[PDB]
Amino acid sequence: DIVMTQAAPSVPVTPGESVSISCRSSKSLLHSNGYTYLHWFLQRPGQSPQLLIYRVSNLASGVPDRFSGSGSGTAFTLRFSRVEAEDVGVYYCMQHLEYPFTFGSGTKLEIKRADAAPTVSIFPPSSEQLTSGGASVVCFLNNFYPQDITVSWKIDGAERSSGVLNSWTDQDSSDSTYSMSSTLTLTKDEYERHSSYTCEATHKTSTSPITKSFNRGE
Amino acid sequence: EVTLQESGGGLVQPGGSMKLSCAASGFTFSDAWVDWVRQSPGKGLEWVAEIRNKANNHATKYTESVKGRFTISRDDSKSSVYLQMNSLRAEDTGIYYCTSVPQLGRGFAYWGQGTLVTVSAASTTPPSVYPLAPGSGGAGSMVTLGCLVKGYFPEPVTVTWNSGALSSGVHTFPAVLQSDLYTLSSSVTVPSSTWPSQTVTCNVAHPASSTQVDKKIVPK
Ligand SMILES: C[N@H+]1[C@H]2CC[C@@H]1[C@@H](C(=O)[O-])[C@@H](OC(=O)c1cccc(O)c1)C2
Secondary structure (H helix, E strand, O other), rough: OOEEEEEOOEEEOOOOHHHHHHHHHOOOEEEOOEEEOOEEEEEEOOOOOOOEEEEEEEEEEOOOOEEEEEEOOOOOEEEOOOHHHHOOOEEEEEEOOOOOOOEEEOOOEEEEOEEEOEEEEEEEOOOOHHOOOOOEEEEEEEEEOOOEEEEEEEEEEEEEOEEEEEEEEOOOOOOEEEEEEEEEEEEEHHHHOOEEEEEEEEOOOOOOOOOOOOOOOO | OOEEEOOOOOOOOOOEEEEEEEEEEEOHHHHHEEEEEEEEEOEEEEEEEEEEOHOOOOEEOOOHHHOOEEEEEHHHHEEEOOOOOEOOOHOEEEEEEEEOOOOOOOOOEEEEOOOEEEOOOOOEEEOOEEEOOOOOOOOOOEEEEEEEEEEOOOOOOOHHHHHHEEEOOOOEEEOEOOEEHHHHHHHEEOOEEEEEEEOOOOEEEEHHOOOEEEEOOOOO
């Protein structure tokens, strides 16, 4: 099997500048007919892959002029003349020379922007859920940057770790921010033994934790 | 207008069998070579199988891990290609996409939207949908509302706000799985001059169970 290598798992870049992504093949992709069988694909979050460049340097129809490709033998490069915020996604190279056809692991393009503090919202269980015997407390930490953030849950001051469900969105294609959802799963019974519920976030935009809480007894 | 459309995915029992279909249009299907590629966490994109055109004797090629279990075929009179999968294992779980090489040297020029295959002995279960309204009072300029979707299986569920009318400040997070099955949340941020004066509704559809639920977000 031909091994396709994309060293960088991701590359940070600021909108407006040019950047390149590289790919290497364990074997020459030059065919007898004289064509070099290496293609580049883009996969935006939640969508199917899409062809950008076929056979090293041919732009597919509909692909923006800012993309170009180069290389030969076993080293290839994908360049952006000017990067745009909407270029967020994962870029894959693929050899189409021998079976089985193989893909590189991909390189995610990350757009750098100004720091953005998360907007934190906490939500007590809906009464509909309580009548059902459940008590999920939800916390949304939205539109922040950079991507790393830490969330802590406190119940009456003491930290809880089990029963916490965390989910993250990909970088937004328009404002380049990230968002996170954190859910504390409790039973109606557990929920009622306590009163203070706290969603605490630690992000680089603040020295002290961002704190949001409410009290069941209200 | 070029398009490839897959169908036939869903929940399937381990050791069971399933057939995926791909319908083409907008290009000379009979000249094209058609392939299936799947995607899963860990392996990323993985080539699965290929069937050539008639001039090339309809020859098939398969990746090692599916040889003997999967069978690819095509029907040019219907501009379709099929992927028959037998003895399904948990490792076959993933998104399957149909793609084609329309002409020599073109690469995988066209791709379908993909269809999710989940191999599991668990059973289909509909979701419960809970509206999430703010505790305190707004103001202040913007208000964030939410929708909690839990207890369903398998994926996916589609969530929209006001039947699609509200799309801008929406974040629908990836589902999380544990003992209560899948739990997914979605939030929407709107001006405080929009809610609660105007009606904000969460619309949830779970194809697998044919469940549809519309829950209004009311001030608590
Ligand atoms: C190294 N080659 C070999 C194996 C992969 C790649 C590919 C290529 O050369 O493009 C193949 O052929 C097609 O995919 C093809 C050929 C004729 C018509 C058509 O629609 C598609 C021939």
